[PDB]
Amino acid sequence: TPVTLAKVIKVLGRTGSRGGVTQVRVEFLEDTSRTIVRNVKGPVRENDILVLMESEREARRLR
Amino acid sequence: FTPVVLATPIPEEVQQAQTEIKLFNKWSFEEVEVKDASLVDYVQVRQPIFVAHTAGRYANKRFRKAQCPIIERLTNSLMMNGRNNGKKLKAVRIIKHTLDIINVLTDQNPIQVVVDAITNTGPREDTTRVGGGGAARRQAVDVSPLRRVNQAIALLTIGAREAAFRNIKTIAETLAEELINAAKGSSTSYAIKKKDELERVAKSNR
Amino acid sequence: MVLIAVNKTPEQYIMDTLLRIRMSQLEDALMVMPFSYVLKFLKFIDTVMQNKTLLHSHLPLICKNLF
Amino acid sequence: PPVLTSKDKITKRMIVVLAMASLETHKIKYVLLNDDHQGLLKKMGRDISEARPDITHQCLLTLLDSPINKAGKLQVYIQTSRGILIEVNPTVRIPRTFKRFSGLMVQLLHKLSIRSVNSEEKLLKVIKNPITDHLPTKCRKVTLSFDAPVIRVQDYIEKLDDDESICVFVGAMARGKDNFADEYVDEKVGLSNYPLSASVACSKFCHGAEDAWNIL
DSSP states (O other): OOOEEEEEOOOOEEOSSSSOOEEEEEEESTTOSOEEEEEESSOOOTTOEEEESSSSOOOOOOO | OOOOOOSSOOOHHHHHHHHHSOOSSSOOSSSOOOOSSSOBTTBOOSSOOSSSOOOOOOSSSTTTGGGSOHHHHHHHHHSOTTTTSSOHHHHHHHHHHHHHHHTTSSOSOTHHHHHHHHHTTOOSSEEEEOOSSSSOOEEEEBOOHHHHHHHHHHHHHHHHHHHTTTSSSOHHHHHHHHHHHHHTTOSOSHHHHHHHHHHHHHHHTO | OOOOSSSSSTHHHHHHHHHHSOSSSHHHHHTTOOHHHHHTTHHHHHHHHHHTOOSSOOHHHHHHHHO | OOOOOSSOOSSOOEEEEEEEEOOOEEEOOEEEOOOOSTTSTTTTTOOSTTOOOHHHHHHHHHHTTSHHHHHTOEEEEEEETTOOEEEEOTTOOOOSSHHHHHHHHHHHHHHSEEEOSSSSSEEEEEEOSOSTTTSOSSEEEEEEOTTSOBOOHHHHHTTSOSSOEEEEEEEOSSSSOSOTTTTTOSEEEBOOSSOOOHHHHHHHHHHHHHHHTTOO
């Protein structure tokens, strides 16, 4: 399974109607110097580690 | 040197194992580590404990809760649903009896089975009720490492209490049944079912 | 061998969104954007510098966003 | 054979939910809306599609007389047009007449449960939404729709696992959209290239299931 780890490098801002989803640009660990902006669900502070499921997909807006 | 036993006597095994190693009641706090390359410092272990009773001041900070010992976090998840509120001495007792069971069958020091049941049931993504206009759809999101700690223990103590509901098999029996079927991925337990059911929907609706 | 962004050149709309945006909290809208936004972005700076246009923008704006 | 309820989540089985059913009460004694009031629907400020319980009685006599109920791998849950979700014990005896069925449904809606006439068990229960808490854990959910692709029943049942149950959602209505379970199911499926009634689709998925699960 393509398990991919990502590290939080900064926080960006809040998007979504539920008010718990946070736009976060992360830097993935293995083979670095590329980054993806993603959307967390629970409480995340900086330099947390998350597990990416898909490799290349980003979301930008939640109504 | 040559320390003797004092006027107030102490049992020998109490004298022996405690000063040598900072263990549990009867369990080491050397080996098993994390096998996952995540959730570090959400795993409290090292620091070690004797028993899982502490007036822990971990509540008034956003992330001091992660520095609570996870074995005592298990006991936090037991003493609920009305009839068990309070009753911390009940929950600490059952944890001891459950650790009696697991270290007998395929010994594998039973905090391994604790750690493996947490890492292998955390849903690594999840969906929310995102609006979209009227018809509230769902969008796949990668949930925090802290909630993956939270949702791991939650599915354990819920499913084990429901399994021990209206039968002969007790709390400590059914909870040990949950841990063995979740330390290895088997989906015969409550949580490994519910982990996969959450992760199959987010793949469908991505 | 599209009717509107707005102008005879579309890049004038690119500066115009920089004209319309407030002087405060613009870094929050800028920090969202990925690296491909930069690769698409510097072409307009080369467009206005080969265009020799400073009528609809100014150099502290372009250097401000650049920085 | 064991009697299946909502408490058992493990045994592979077939569950049908008559969603969007027409259960409306009326005062004159409390009576159901239908025959008896088709000349007084507008007089009471009511709707015609809100007066169709014969489809529900028809589908209950369809499903509960199926041999898979007699084999014991079937559960019936019913959601009204107002959303009232109902657990049906499969050993219940439905009256064949519309009148005793009607007083039974009035007694169900006002008394909020029907109990056994011989033992200490619920013959009928009003349960809470959502359905997925009441459903078993591993279970495929599909919505019957004529505007959904038409497949064969037996093969797609043979696509399932040994532990995955099956449940299907039927809009118990005269007409309208089949969008009552967009928030729930994995797949919308069709059974025929022709428009059907609900009970014919019920007997289709029942008899295809009994052909697949070897029920005679």
